[PDB]
Structure 1
Amino acid sequence: SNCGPPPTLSFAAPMDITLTETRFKTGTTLKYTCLPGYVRSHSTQTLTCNSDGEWVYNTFCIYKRCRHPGELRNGQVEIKTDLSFGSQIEFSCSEGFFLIGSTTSRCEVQDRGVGWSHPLPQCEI
């Protein structure tokens, strides 16, 4: 009926970093908060130990998204999937131009939010 230690979530972490007594009375509820790169998408950010001795929870976080970085002068900013954490955008230059810098950038953890890994390249000539 009782739980062992909770499973680790890829999207959130426990709020108290307490002793984590390896055993928990049935009915215990543990509070979580979103990891960097994630934002809350549900009202209940808990894990609860049910009568079967198992931890129950929803995926209560989703990816943060980066702001669109704007236009590339004489080139193109291409979205491949979206601007969410982990996603990549691609850069190219128009016919009469050379691309100097990176052809890609990725939404990554930055500060306490999310930002682009690489600066926009330049299209020159």
Structure 2
Amino acid sequence: SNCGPPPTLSFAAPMDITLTETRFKTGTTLKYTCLPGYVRSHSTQTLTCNSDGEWVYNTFCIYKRCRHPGELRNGQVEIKTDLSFGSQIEFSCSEGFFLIGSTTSRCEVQDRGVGWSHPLPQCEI
């Protein structure tokens, strides 16, 4: 009847109670917080220990979404996946227009939020 350390998470870290003992009461809960790139998903950002030595939670943090970076005059901003954290958008020009600058951008953590890694390109000539 005993669960060890919490599993560490990709999406959230614990709210600092670092003065922690080797295992945790078979009914204890754990207040968490979203990591950079993620926003709070459910009412409950928490882990919990059940009667039989396991850790259990619902994923309470989801990829934050970027702004759409606006029109690309004479080009095409193409969303591969989506516009949320970790996802790439591609730039490409039309007709005779060549593209100058980055051909990709990725929702990266920026400030306390989430922006595009590379600036928009110019679609010119």
Alignment TM-score, normalising by the size of structure 2: 0.95
When structure 1 is superposed on structure 2, of 110-119 and 54-63 the one drifting more is 54-63
SS of 1:62's equivalent? strand
The answer for unaligned runs of 5 or more in structure 2 is none
Shift of 1:81: 1.5
Query: In 1, Cα distance between the equivalents of 2:66 and 2:90?
Result: 14
Shift of 1:40: 1.2
Query: In 1, Cα distance between the equivalents of 2:46 and 2:110?
Result: 26
When structure 1 is superposed on structure 2, of 94-103 and 62-71 the one drifting more is 94-103
The answer for unaligned runs of 5 or more in structure 1 is none
Q: 1:17 to 1:100 in 2, by over 3 A?
A: farther
Q: Deviations over 1:1-38 (max 9, x none)?
A: 12210000111000015123221111111100111111
- Give percent identity, aligned residues only: 100
Query: In 2, Cα distance between the equivalents of 1:123 and 1:93?
Result: 6
Runs of 4+ residues deviating >3 angstroms: none
* Conservation of the 8 A alpha-carbon contact between 1:5 and 1:20: no
Aligned length: 125
* Conservation of the 8 A alpha-carbon contact between 1:79 and 1:89: yes
Shift of 1:49: 1.0
Match of 2:56 in 1: 56
* Conservation of the 8 A alpha-carbon contact between 1:42 and 1:61: yes
